């Protein structure tokens, strides 16, 4: 069970949107980070609660 | 000596810093129908070049 | 010595100011007050999620503007207008809206690498008479420079325009350097230093945009002091002639000209400039008012040499030994540089030795070293 139940739990895994990689140019104190995705441009966006 | 040195870098760092995303005081409310001109859109635009 | 027990104060009066800093960001720092709960929202819910770094090309009054974004794409974009519709500049960096592309905000500021050159974090450990001696011609460098920012009230009773900019020239290792650095420490203002060797480029037509640059940042903060060191480099140091040459170094002094003085109307840019080839320089450089008391600084003699050394010498171990009288009657209106590499190369003896006491020995064998480096280039031996 616990074999098949791993297979069936990895096809929900594997589904992503895209998930990048980003290098932080700077924070700004209003609890956002300027990011700069590597291949595109500068955004500011905000934080999760993990960091 | 090198307790002075320590203790400003701490006290900068714990104090924080702030950087400005401006506004203004004399507004409070903007998005009675700022959300018109945003959320539904009304329009911002590519901007093009006439070659014929 | 014997200065423990006051810097156990201020190491005091820093713990009070570490604590009472915490414990108020800690919990205390109430955001359960309304004037900071409605004003961040109703902020955020017009502000994104994604905020799409753009560039402000030109700015159109009606409330509209045409950004162009790194990522490709301009815009015709709006604003939400609680941010004062004229605030805002070419130049700057906004937030557009990760929906509808709007103004969100304005980011107040951003700055480059090549600033990064001018601009310093310094705060010199010297402060002055470590340039104890040649102490007139440095009342042309403390009157001019300095005095201006302190009392604007002695110039208002005559009236009449502030003074303005200096050229330092002499001999090279009389001080200039340290003449600079020195007045930086008194007025804390905005010091930007810069050297002429980076003002020369291999690379044309980024020269002239440097050189504008320098002092239009200085005119942005409101007082600023700008050490142009060694504006002797600009007809002495070139790379190849196909991309530096005439041509480069033309143009460079032309834009000088203007930002020196011009048409700008820019901040307060007190200059200083240390030359000893001050006949490469335009004249509508050393004009006057650009220059208003000049400066020339020749070899001290025997008397201000007694001065220097004894700046020198008291940061080192001493003895009765040590006799400093007799090392000035064998120098000669040499420059304070040689002295100071004197008593930098006395301690290298001591190091030699691993002994850490300094001697009058010390001192007179490196003056032969010093003595050495004057007079072998030199292969007459006697004037021929
Ligand atoms: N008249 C003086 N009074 C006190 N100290 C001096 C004097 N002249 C030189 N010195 C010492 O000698 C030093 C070496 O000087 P510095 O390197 O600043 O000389 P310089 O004249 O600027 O050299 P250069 O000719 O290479 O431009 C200074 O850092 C300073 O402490
Ligand atoms: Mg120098």
Redesign the interface.
């Given at each position: 069970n616990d074999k098949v139940r791993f297979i069936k739990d990895e096809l929900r895994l594997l589904q992503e949107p895209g998930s990048y990689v980003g290098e932080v140019i700077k924070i700004?104190?209003?609890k956002?980070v300027?990011v700069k995705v590597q291949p595109?441009?500068?955004?500011?966006?905000?934080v999760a609660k993990d960091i | 000596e090198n307790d002075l040195k320590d203790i400003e870098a701490r006290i900068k760092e714990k104090a924080?810093?702030?950087?400005s995303?401006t506004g203004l005081a004399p507004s409070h409310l903007w998005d009675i129908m700022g959300d018109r001109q945003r959320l539904g859109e009304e329009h911002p635009l590519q901007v093009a070049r006439c070659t014929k | 010595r014997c200065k423990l027990k006051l810097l156990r104060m201020e190491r005091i009066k820093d713990h009070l100011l570490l604590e009472e800093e915490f414990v108020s960001n800690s919990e205390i720092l109430k955001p359960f007050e309304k004037k900071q709960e409605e004003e961040k929202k109703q902020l955020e819910e017009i502000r994104?999620?994604?905020?799409?770094?753009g560039t402000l090309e030109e700015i159109i009054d009606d409330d509209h503007a045409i950004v162009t974004?790194?990522?490709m794409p301009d815009y015709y974009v709006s604003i939400l207008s609680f941010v004062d519709k004229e605030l805002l500049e070419p130049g700057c960096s906004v937030?557009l809206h990760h929906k509808t592309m709007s103004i969100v905000g304005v980011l107040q500021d951003d700055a480059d690498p090549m600033v990064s050159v001018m601009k310093m974090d310094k705060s010199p450990t010297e402060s002055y008479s470590d340039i104890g001696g040649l102490e007139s011609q440095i009342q042309e460098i403390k009157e001019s420079v300095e005095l201006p920012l302190t009392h604007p009230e002695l110039y208002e009773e005559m009236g009449i325009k502030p003074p303005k900019g200096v050229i330092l020239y002499g001999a090279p290792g009389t001080g200039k350097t340290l003449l600079a650095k020195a007045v930086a420490n008194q007025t804390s203002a905005t010091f930007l230093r810069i050297v002429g060797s980076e003002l020369i480029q291999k690379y044309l037509g980024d020269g002239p945009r440097l050189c504008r640059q320098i002092f239009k940042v200085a005119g942005e903060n409101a007082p600023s002091i700008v050490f142009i060191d060694e504006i002797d480099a600009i007809g002495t140091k070139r790379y190849d002639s196909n991309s530096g040459g005439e041509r480069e170094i033309q143009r460079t002094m032309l834009e000088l000209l203007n930002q020196l003085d011009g048409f700008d109307d820019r901040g307060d840019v007190k200059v200083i400039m240390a030359t000893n080839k001050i006949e490469t320089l335009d004249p509508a450089l050393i004009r006057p008012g650009r220059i208003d008391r000049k400066i020339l600084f020749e070899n001290p003699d025997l008397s201000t040499k007694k001065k220097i050394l004894g700046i020198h010498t008291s940061k080192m171990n001493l003895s009765e030994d040590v006799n400093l009288e007799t090392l000035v009657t064998t120098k000669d209106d040499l420059s304070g540089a040689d002295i100071q590499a004197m008593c930098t190369e006395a301690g290298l003896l001591a190091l030699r030795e691993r002994r850490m006491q300094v001697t009058a020995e010390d001192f007179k064998q490196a003056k032969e070293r010093v003595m050495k480096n004057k007079v072998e280039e030199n292969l007459e031996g006697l004037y021929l």
């Open positions: 700004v104190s209003d956002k300027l595109e441009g500068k955004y500011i966006v905000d | 924080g810093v702030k950087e995303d | 994104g999620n994604p905020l799409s770094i974004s790194p990522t937030l």
